[PDB]
Amino acid sequence: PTLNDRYLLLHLLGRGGFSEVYKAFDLTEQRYVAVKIHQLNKNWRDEKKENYHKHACREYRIHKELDHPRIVKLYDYFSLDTDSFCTVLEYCEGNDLDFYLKQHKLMSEKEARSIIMQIVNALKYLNEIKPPIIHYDLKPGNILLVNGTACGEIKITDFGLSKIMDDDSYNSVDGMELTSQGAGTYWYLPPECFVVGKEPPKISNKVDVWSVGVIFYQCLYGRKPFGHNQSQQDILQENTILKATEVQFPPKPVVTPEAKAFIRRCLAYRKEDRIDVQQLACDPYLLP
Ligand SMILES: Nc1ncnc2c1ncn2[C@@H]1O[C@H](COP(=O)(O)OP(=O)(O)OP(O)(O)=S)[C@@H](O)[C@H]1O
C-alpha cells in the first residue's frame, strides 16, 4: 500500500494523538522506516488547521537538520490530501523510558547513569549546532530505549516545544524570553518557567539541566522529586515548582553521595547557581 512512490506500508506500530505510525519499507534506500501519518480533522476548520500545520512544519525543520546517534533521525515529509501529511523517521525498536518505569518501578544507579550520559551527549550536540537548541520537553516519554533495556542504547525525540537560541532571541547575559508560557510537562521544568508577571521569563539551556536532574532522580527512586502526586493544574495552583528549593532523598534505595551531589548541581533552584549544558557535559560524575 505504497506512499510517495517508495514507502511500502507494512503494519501498524502505534497511534499518537492525531496520528498513526506504520512500519514501512523504503524501496529507494532499501531500509525499514517509520511513516507517521498525521490525520486532522474536518471540523477544526480555518484557524486551528494552519497553526497545527505550522507547529508541525516548525518541528520538522528543526529536527530534519539534527544528525547524532542519540537523536532519532527524520528522513522525509510529504502531504497526502489537504487534511493530512506524513513524516518519515528512523525505525526504532522497543518502547520508551516512561513505559519501562511503569513495568519496573525504578532502576539501578549504574543503569540510571548509563541513560543520563547518553542524554547529556545529545544535549552537548544540541549546544554545538548551527544556532543552539533548548530541547524544552525532556521527559521519559521522549527517551526511547531502543534495545529494550536500561543498560542499552537510547535516543531522544520530540522537538515540538524546542526553543532556538539564535542571535535575535538569545544572548549569554540575559538569555531568551520564554515563548509559550504554560506549555510542557511541569514536573521536568525549572522554577524560572513558572514566574508570571509583566514580562515573560528569561531562560537558557539550563532548563534542560533541570530536566536531566529530575529524570535521573526518577530513574533511581521511582518517584518524581517535586509534585509527585499532583496534576498539572495542581502544580500551578500550589506553586509546587516555585517551592522546590531543596531536594530530599529517601534513605532506600541506596544511591552514592556522588550521585546525590550530581542531582543537587542539576536541581539548583536559582538558575545562576545551576550548571549549564556545557558544564553538565564535563561533570565529574559522568566521566568514564
Ligand atoms: N521512529 C519510530 N519507530 C518505531 N515506532 C515509532 C516511531 N515513532 C513513533 N512510533 C510509534 O508510534 C507511537 C506513538 O507515536 P508518537 O509520535 O511517539 O506519539 P505522540 O507524540 O503522542 O504523537 P502526536 O500526538 O501525533 S505528536 C509510539 O508508541 C510508537 O510505537
Residue numbers in the entry: 456 to 743
From the paper:
The divergent sequence conservation of the catalytic domain of TLK2, when compared to other kinases, is reflected in its structure. Our unphosphorylated ATPγS TLK2 structure is in a pre-active conformation. Although the R-spine is in the correct alignment to create a platform for an active conformation, important hallmarks of the active state, such as the salt bridge between the conserved lysine and glutamate in the β3 and αC helix (K491 and E514 in TLK2) are not observed. Out of the 15 phosphosites, we can locate nine of them in the structure of the kinase domain, mainly in the C-lobe, around the catalytic and activation loops. Unfortunately, we cannot observe the residues phosphorylated in the C-tail (T750 to S771) because this region was not included in our crystallized protein. The modelling of a phosphoserine instead of S474 in the P-loop of the kinase domain suggests that this modification could affect nucleotide binding, leading to a reduction in activity. The H518R mutation is located on the bottom of αC-helix and is conserved in other kinases, constituting the RS3 of the regulatory spine.
Human TLK1 and TLK2 polypeptides are composed of an N-terminal region, a middle region of helices predicted to contain three coiled coils (CC) and a C-terminal kinase domain that shows 94% identity between TLK1 and TLK2. The precise mechanisms by which ASF1 is regulated remain unclear, but ASF1 was identified as a target of the Tousled kinase (TSL) and Tousled-like kinases (TLKs) that can influence its stability and histone binding capacity.
